[PDB]
Design a protein around this ligand. Structure first.
Ligand SMILES: CCCCCCCCCCCCCCCCCC(=O)OC[C@H](COP(=O)([O-])OCC(O)COP(=O)([O-])OC[C@@H](COC(=O)CCCCCCCCCCCCCCCCC)OC(=O)CCCCCCCCCCCCCCCCC)OC(=O)CCCCCCCCCCCCCCCCC
Ligand SMILES: CCCCCCCCCCCCCCCCCC(=O)OC[C@H](COP(=O)([O-])OCC(O)COP(=O)([O-])OC[C@@H](COC(=O)CCCCCCCCCCCCCCCCC)OC(=O)CCCCCCCCCCCCCCCCC)OC(=O)CCCCCCCCCCCCCCCCC
Ligand SMILES: CCCCCCCCCCCCCCCCCC(=O)OC[C@H](COP(=O)([O-])OCC[N+](C)(C)C)OC(=O)CCCCCCCCCCCCCCCCC
Ligand SMILES: CCCCCCCCCCCCCCCCCC(=O)OC[C@H](COP(=O)(O)OCCN)OC(=O)CCCCCCCCCCCCCCCCC
Ligand SMILES: CCCCCCCCCCCCCCCCCC(=O)OC[C@H](COP(=O)(O)OCCN)OC(=O)CCCCCCCCCCCCCCCCC
Ligand SMILES: CCCCCCCCCCCCCCCCCC(=O)OC[C@H](COP(=O)(O)OCCN)OC(=O)CCCCCCCCCCCCCCCCC
Ligand SMILES: Nc1ncnc2c1ncn2[C@@H]1O[C@H](COP(=O)(O)O)[C@@H](O)[C@H]1O
Lengths: 98, 320, 120, 80, 49, 52, 50, 48, 63, 347
């Protein structure tokens, strides 16, 4: 397919691979997840402006707002983890092995 | 139930009945500290509902006809046999202690349920917060094993964390000499077999373990053998306290609604007393449990739910 | 499969054409079995709350039976409607494509040769 | 309902001003006569091209020139 | 009396029992009316009279 | 489970943003208004299998 | 009845037996139509089997 | 079928446990051979 | 029961079940043809309703 | 939790699933999944302990990854189709992404690695919601996009889900993880028959929700979370003892019970379409589910009985718990098989 869309998809898959190989922190997971959301915003915006499809121009803002609210929820979860262990480490989140 | 979340929606808020007299006061002391009169005296000065000390047959007194059941259905343990042989083979020591912990847990649930359904305070005698002080004093006498202390600490860790501490802990200082004097003057032939060092270890776990950890979570009031005789000085100490510690202060309608829904469900209160941690003093096999249960079902009033027993005179059953 | 049929008139539990079909009788064995399920739910409800199972809550067992029969009557109407729609669409598609459904020439066994396999 | 109003105007005049302004912002667009003119001005603002119609023969309400009598006129907007 | 505490089901809840019998009788009479209207509609659409 | 409530009750909750050829603000055309209109008018009502 | 339980199984037989007869009138599609047992009806006879 | 049964048992002898893997891989390769013969579909196309 | 009744009842049973078996084979064949060609009332997966398209004159003429 | 806030949050969960069910637009599908997740996060944290925060964190990460993959599939559909109708997808790349994302939202293997954890971390009613109500929206989207779902991918995910939900039930004493692996196996069963007859998908879904709701309602009535804690049911409430186990004999898939109703019908739709090997393998793995769950049945109705003495006190108190629809759901999860042709109502 097209070229700049392939670049935005490449960024989406790169932040996906960063979202699928955890190093140390939960904040790194939330950052890779919101980089994915950013690339979804960029690619949706370029499609909607390309076709001159007018009513969908409110769609990326919608795609922003919900997902930003989603990120807020994720941040609050991280905080409660960091109120139990002192760190946001993903290896402290292993009590559900049994 | 009668109280539920819909009653909380329709306006039955349990801080509306929380007044300054709504206090849960636990009177603590040694075996014959003579506090059993004092607590009743507080019940006729502060206007509080006295709950007696939970014996073997507390749950028998709360349910059914209110009479004590035979010992095979309730307890399977005797206080007087613990007075005779504390180092017995079959393990009456930890079995009697665990049944008393469950009975005091039902007493404390009834105490909080009365306090949250009426707004009238409750005077308790030796609540669940002051029960391990016998267990430790049993384990210091070799009457039980370490695995019994582990089982009790498991049950306490999963049961006492759901509740609030009492408002006032009234402790009575009576030394071992006057305790033995009142035991020998009491006249119970089984109770006089209590040794000296057992009472000493009760008083040691009282003074060194119970009261210092109760000092942070509530306010204790400590009395000797003779100044606890006057009820008016005790009531003047209670009323002129300034309640400033403990988790009772950050209690809104939501936390107290959760606690009141917790304590009215008696099987959820008594849930973790019978955890499947297999200890030989409390483990009953399948044949004995089956036989005792089928003998329990044929008791009068115990065959069905309480409003549904034709043998004790329940009418309108076919419309209930 | 038949979701194109319920796409020009959505969310109709019983269409108007379902009224052209006979309803289930009130002595339907399926409906009496659903009433038996209501009686079983009443007995289990009086059993799990430790009530006298046959005696207690006869109004409650009567409402269990009545509620299961009431829902099951309409479920049987919708079942009969959906199998009637299935056969109606089948017969219309058979009638509208004779070239895909030829009449097979039925041969008698005096012409049909079967290889005999002896059993011994 | 009046002593409570004086009490809340004494204690918390900010919230009284906020609820009063919000209540007026809700009710007053319907109690107004000039609200319909907002609708009329926004539907008479020509963002597009007024695409003409083929004259079939019988259309009395459609003009042939902008300086004709028939057609939607904005005398009310010029005058008000 | 026999019980030391009053049970929640010592007496029949007459509002609940009355609503139970009334709702069940309503479902029966509405079911019978629906079945009679359906057999009348079937005989009117298919001509079995 | 596609409970088509919008066709049962007769409400337009999200049909307007669905295609490009719908009623746009100030009659703005999309870039492919004619092509999408012809694909929709071709493939209308005949089902997906015949429409492909 | 003093022994009312002792007719759960016999009467439960009879009704069951009854239902078999009730099914046979629904399997009467070839009554007096088989190529083997077909015949003309006798006087005072309306069906061959019931 | 018998040759791929021999091949499955040959793959099972280099797997170890020995005779069980012999029989399992032999029966599995037998099913592969019979699927190649009679046209057995594992991911069958939806047809009706 | 009589051999007449059993014989003719067996013939009715065989009629009903042979008719159901013929209809089940027709059910399989009808489903196969309707999935394969898509011209029957079944397998009608939805397309875009053409009642959504605007037909008013737009801003630019070329569309 | 404030009960008005609980009612509002539960209606928001139901509203998010309804918005996924009724919408003709992809943005509203995504909005309904976002609303459903956002509202169900406090349901898991009803008790405020660290295991619920860990469970909610794992659930947030998996469902957020699935939501972003769903939006990427929607965006690629808008590339190759220029439109937004919830219908078949017009790119097999977008089809593969939406199939993977809905398998993540259902917890189908190999995206199953969050289902036994989160169900372990949360209470029994929230696990009931997670294993009954949260299946309804992605199965609805799979119902609406099946002309684009790849056959080989959905069959791979189906049989891998059935095998891993089978071999997950061996080593477990936790009732909630056993319900989670039973969830994974049944989602493999539902998506096995999706491209052949989705009416049997809805039948399997309804029978699964009825059996799972009966089992979680029994677990809430007895307040038992482990096998060893379930083993004391015979002495406390003996009527509770067998109903769990005839419901679990149903959940294995076993005649004449109604849990034999889905799987048989699934086989009945896959031997039509000339697949004989695949339902054979899947239902042999269902017999492996019977193997482990029958071992649990032996655990409760038989050998490992013995009681403790405090149980004698529980004899003097009935269950005041709301066992809501539990006789109805227990009758509907066993004795429904003679009404098996009721399934035509799900067309
Ligand atoms: C009918 C079947 C369903 C009955 C459910 C309730 C049973 C019950 O409460 O029994 C107690 C009650 C008697 O008890 P009671 O005198 O009140 O005193 C309590 C006892 O002391 C009880 O003592 P306890 O409670 O202190 O404890 C003792 C303990 C002793 O037990 C133990 O210690 C452990 C248990 C023993 C080992 C396990 C045994 C087997 C368990 C599994 C069975 C599965 C079989 C199902 C099929 C196989 C597939 C799984 O437990 C029990 O005895 C359990 C009590 C219930 C026994 C019966 C259970 C039936 C439900 C489960 C099977 C049926 C549903 C699934 C069907 C699937 C498809 C066929 O029994 C009955 O009332 C039975 C019904 C008799 C009359 C039936 C009339 C039917 C009329 C129908 C037509 C009319 C209506 C028409 C409607 C339509 C109109 C249009
Ligand atoms: C249509 C599908 C409907 C599906 C079920 C809808 C309700 C379930 C969800 C809500 C819920 O939990 O309701 C409680 C639920 C009872 O469940 P429960 O709490 O587990 O029952 C425990 C005891 O029964 C509670 O006993 P109690 O001591 O509290 O007092 C007696 C109580 C008092 O109740 C009343 O007073 C009710 C009358 C007043 C209603 C409100 C008026 C304002 O009566 C009952 O609750 C009797 C049981 C009612 C039948 C339950 C099951 C209904 C049938 C479900 C569908 C079955 C389909 C089978 C298909 C088989 C073939 C596929 O329903 C009611 O209380 C009202 C029943 C209304 C039935 C309407 C049927 C026609 C609808 C069209
Ligand atoms: C061994 C027991 C299982 C065999 C089940 C086969 C039943 C059947 O209908 O077979 C026909 C089918 C064949 O399907 P088919 O009939 O579509 O075969 C192709 C069509 N013909 C024959 C016309 C060329 O047999 C199988 O699928 C055999 C493999 C069964 C599954 C694997 C079993 C492994 C061991 C357990
Ligand atoms: C319908 C129109 C649209 C309405 C929505 C839009 C409103 C815009 C403003 C939004 C404000 C959001 C926050 C509002 C919170 C209200 C509750 C509240 O504040 O209660 C507490 C307060 C008591 O004060 P206290 O707790 O001491 O404050 C801390 C600092 N001392 O309690 C109070 O001070 C009482 C406050 C509530 C009563 C105010 C009544 C104002 C009446 C004005 C005239 C009538 C207006 C018509 C509409 C009726 C409004 C009630
Ligand atoms: C108990 C059932 C109560 C049902 C009340 C009425 C609900 C209703 O209107 O349902 C409509 C639905 C048929 O609608 P339909 O267009 O066929 O659905 C397409 C499916 N994707 O009807 C049905 O699906 C009927 C069966 C519903 C069963 C729900 C409980 C199981
Ligand atoms: C084509 C079909 C389309 C779809 C058809 C319909 C699908 C319905 C799916 C239902 C899923 C229900 C999930 C559970 C209910 C949601 C709210 C909830 O959890 O309520 C339970 C409630 C919570 O009370 P709480 O105080 O939190 O208890 C925990 C201990 N404190 O109270 C309790 O915990 C009390 C214990 C009993 C709770 C029983 C709830 C059963 C609900 C499901 C019934 C069966 C499914 C519906 C009928 C068949 C249709 C599939
Ligand atoms: N370890 C223990 N040994 C003896 N009595 C105990 C023990 N724990 C609790 N008690 C109770 O404490 C009571 C003594 O208090 P009193 O009623 O004042 O004599 C006994 O009758 C028992 O019910």
């Amino acid at each position: 397919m097209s070229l700049v869309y392939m670049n935005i998809m490449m960024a989406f898959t790169v932040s996906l691979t960063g979202l699928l190989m955890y190093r140390s922190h939960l904040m790194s997971s939330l950052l890779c997840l919101e980089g994915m959301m950013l690339s979804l915003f960029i690619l949706a915006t370029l499609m909607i402006l390309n076709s001159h499809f007018t009513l969908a121009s409110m769609m990326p803002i919608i795609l922003l707002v919900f997902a930003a609210c989603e990120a807020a929820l994720g941040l609050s979860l991280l905080v409660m983890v960091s109120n139990t262990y002192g760190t946001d480490y993903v290896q402290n989140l292993n009590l559900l092995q049994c | 139930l009668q109280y539920g979340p819909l009653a909380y929606i329709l306006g039955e808020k349990t801080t509306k009945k929380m007044t300054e007299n709504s206090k849960l006061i636990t009177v603590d002391g040694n075996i014959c500290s003579g506090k059993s009169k004092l607590a009743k005296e507080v019940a006729e000065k502060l206007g509080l509902k006295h709950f007696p000390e939970a014996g073997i047959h507390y749950a028998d007194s709360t349910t059914g006809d209110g009479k004590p059941l035979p010992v095979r259905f309730s307890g399977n343990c005797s206080l007087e046999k613990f007075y005779d042989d504390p180092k017995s083979n079959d393990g009456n020591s930890y079995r009697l202690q665990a049944w008393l912990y469950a009975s005091r847990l039902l007493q404390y649930a009834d105490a909080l349920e009365h306090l949250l359904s009426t707004g009238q305070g409750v005077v308790l005698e030796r609540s669940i917060y002051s029960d391990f002080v016998f267990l430790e004093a049993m384990y210091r006498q070799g009457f039980i094993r370490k695995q019994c202390v582990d089982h009790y600490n498991q049950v306490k860790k999963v049961t006492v964390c759901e509740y609030l501490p009492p408002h006032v802990v009234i402790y009575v200082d009576v030394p071992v000499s006057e305790v033995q004097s009142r035991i020998q003057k009491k006249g119970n032939p089984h109770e006089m077999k209590i040794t000296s060092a057992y009472l000493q270890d009760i008083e040691n776990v009282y003074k060194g373990t119970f009261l210092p950890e109760m000092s942070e979570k509530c306010e204790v009031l400590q009395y000797s053998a003779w100044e606890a005789e006057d009820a008016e000085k005790v009531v003047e100490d209670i009323q002129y306290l300034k309640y400033d510690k403990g988790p009772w202060l950050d209690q809104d309608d939501r936390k107290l609604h959760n606690l009141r829904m917790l304590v009215q469900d008696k099987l959820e209160v008594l849930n973790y007393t019978s955890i499947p941690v297999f200890l030989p003093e409390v483990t009953i096999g399948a044949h004995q449990s089956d036989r005792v249960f089928q003998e329990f079902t044929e008791l009068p009033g115990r065959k069905y739910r309480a409003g549904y027993n034709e043998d004790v005179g329940d009418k309108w059953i076919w419309l209930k | 499969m038949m979701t194109g049929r319920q796409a020009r008139a959505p969310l109709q539990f019983l269409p108007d054409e379902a009224r052209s079909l006979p309803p289930p009788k009130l002595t339907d064995p399926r409906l009496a079995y659903i009433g038996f399920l209501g009686y079983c739910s009443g007995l289990i409800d009086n059993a799990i709350r430790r009530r006298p199972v046959l005696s207690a809550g006869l109004h409650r067992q009567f409402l269990y039976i009545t509620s299961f029969v009431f829902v099951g009557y309409y479920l049987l109407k919708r079942q009969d409607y959906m199998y009637a729609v299935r056969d109606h669409d089948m017969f219309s598609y058979i009638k509208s494509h004779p070239e895909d459904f030829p009449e097979k020439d039925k041969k008698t066994y005096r012409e049909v040769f079967e290889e005999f396999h002896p059993v011994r | 309902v009046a002593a409570f109003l004086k009490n809340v105007w004494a204690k918390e005049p900010v919230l009284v001003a906020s609820f009063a302004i919000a209540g007026l912002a809700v009710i007053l667009p319907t109690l107004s006569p000039y609200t319909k003119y907002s609708l009329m001005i926004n539907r008479a603002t020509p963002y597009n091209y007024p695409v003409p119609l083929r004259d079939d023969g019988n259309m009395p309400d459609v003009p042939s020139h902008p300086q004709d009598p028939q057609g939607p006129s904005l005398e009310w907007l010029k005058r008000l | 009396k026999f019980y030391i505490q009053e049970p929640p089901h010592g007496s029949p809840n007459w509002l609940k029992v009355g609503l139970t019998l009334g709702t069940s009788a309503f479902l029966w009479i509405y079911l019978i009316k629906q079945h009679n209207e359906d057999v009348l509609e079937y005989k009117r659409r298919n001509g079995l009279e | 489970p596609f409970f088509d409530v919008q066709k049962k009750l007769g409400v337009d909750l999200d049909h307007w943003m669905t295609i490009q050829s719908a009623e746009q603000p100030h009659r703005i055309p999309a870039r492919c208004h004619a092509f999408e209109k012809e694909w929709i008018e071709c493939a209308h009502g005949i089902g997906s299998i015949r429409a492909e | 009845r003093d022994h009312w339980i002792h007719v759960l199984v016999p009467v439960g037989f009879v009704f069951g037996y009854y239902l078999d007869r009730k099914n046979d009138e629904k399997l009467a599609a070839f009554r007096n139509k088989s190529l083997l047992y077909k015949r003309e009806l006798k006087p005072q006879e309306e069906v061959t089997w019931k | 079928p018998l040759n791929y049964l021999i091949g499955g048992c040959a793959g099972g002898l280099t797997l170890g446990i020995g005779a069980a893997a012999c029989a399992y891989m032999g029966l599995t390769a037998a099913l592969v051979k019979m699927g190649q013969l009679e046209g057995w579909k594992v991911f069958a196309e939806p047809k009706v | 029961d009589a051999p007449e009744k059993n014989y003719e009842r067996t013939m009715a049973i065989l009629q009903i079940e042979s008719e159901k078996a013929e209809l089940r084979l027709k059910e399989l064949e009808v489903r196969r043809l309707m999935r394969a060609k898509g011209d029957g009332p079944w397998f009608q997966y939805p397309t875009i309703d053409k009642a959504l398209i605007d037909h008013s004159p737009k801003a630019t003429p070329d569309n | 939790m404030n009960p008005i806030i609980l009612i509002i949050i539960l209606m928001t969960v139901m509203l998010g699933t309804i918005i996924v069910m009724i919408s003709t637009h992809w943005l509203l599908i995504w909005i309904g999944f976002e609303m459903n997740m956002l509202a169900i996060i406090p349901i898991m944290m009803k008790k405020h302990n660290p295991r619920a925060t860990e469970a909610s964190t794992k659930y947030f990460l998996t469902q957020s990854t699935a939501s972003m993959l769903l939006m990427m599939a929607i965006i690629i559909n808008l590339m190759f189709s220029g439109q937004w109708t919830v219908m078949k997808l017009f790119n097999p790349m977008a089809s593969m992404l939406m199939t993977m994302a809905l398998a993540m939202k259902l917890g189908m293997a190999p995206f199953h690695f969050w289902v036994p954890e989160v169900t372990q971390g949360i209470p029994l009613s929230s696990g009931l919601i997670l294993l009954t109500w949260q299946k309804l929206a992605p199965m609805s989207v799979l119902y609406q996009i099946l002309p684009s779902i790849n056959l080989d991918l959905i069959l791979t995910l189906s049989i891998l889900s059935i095998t891993i939900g089978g071999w997950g039930g061996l080593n477990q004493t936790q009732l909630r993880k056993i319900m989670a692996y039973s969830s994974i196996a049944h989602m493999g069963w539902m998506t096995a028959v999706l491209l052949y007859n989705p009416t049997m998908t809805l039948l399997n879904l309804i029978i699964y929700i009825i059996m799972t709701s009966t089992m979680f309602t029994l677990f809430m009535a007895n307040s038992t979370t482990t096998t060893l804690s379930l083993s004391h049911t015979w002495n406390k409430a003996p009527i509770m003892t067998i109903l769990v186990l005839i419901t679990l004999l149903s959940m294995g898939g076993l005649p004449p019970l109604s849990g034999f109703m889905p799987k048989w019908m699934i086989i009945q739709e896959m031997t039509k379409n000339d697949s004989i090997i695949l339902p054979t393998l899947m239902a042999i793995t269902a017999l492996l589910n019977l193997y482990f769950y029958m071992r649990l049945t032996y655990s409760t109705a038989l050998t490992m009985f013995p009681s403790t003495n405090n149980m004698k006190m529980k004899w003097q108190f009935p269950t005041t718990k709301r066992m809501t629809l539990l006789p109805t759901m227990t009758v509907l999860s066993t004795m429904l098989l003679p009404l098996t042709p009721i399934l035509s109502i799900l067309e």
